[PDB]
Design a protein around this nucleic acid. Sequence first.
DNA 1: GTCGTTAGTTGTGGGACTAAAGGATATCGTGAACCGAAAAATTAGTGTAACGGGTATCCCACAACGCTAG
Length: 49
Amino acid sequence: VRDNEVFTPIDLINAKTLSSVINSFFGTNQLSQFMDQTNPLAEITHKRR
DNA sequence: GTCGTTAGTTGTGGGACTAAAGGATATCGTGAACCGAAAAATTAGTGTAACGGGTATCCCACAACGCTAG
């Protein structure tokens, strides 16, 4: 869309379009699970599931 | 030789899948410019004090006797 010479590779980039995907993965994916934090064994088992 | 009929597929579509507890999520991409609407803030303008009688009420104090003679 840009034809003016006043445009640099900073104005071209949106952080939102990457942060959105990463936050969606870490907040709503079935594999991003609430850790079993009852005891150390629960953590060490959940991390090896 | 040709056309309707019947039964047995065959592919495709619609409908089921305990009970109890619990129950947190994250959610892009951008084009400009002017006009209208109403909701809000700022500004401009007017003011009493005691007196006469007469009488309604209040608080505040006091009274509500006893004896003798014609």
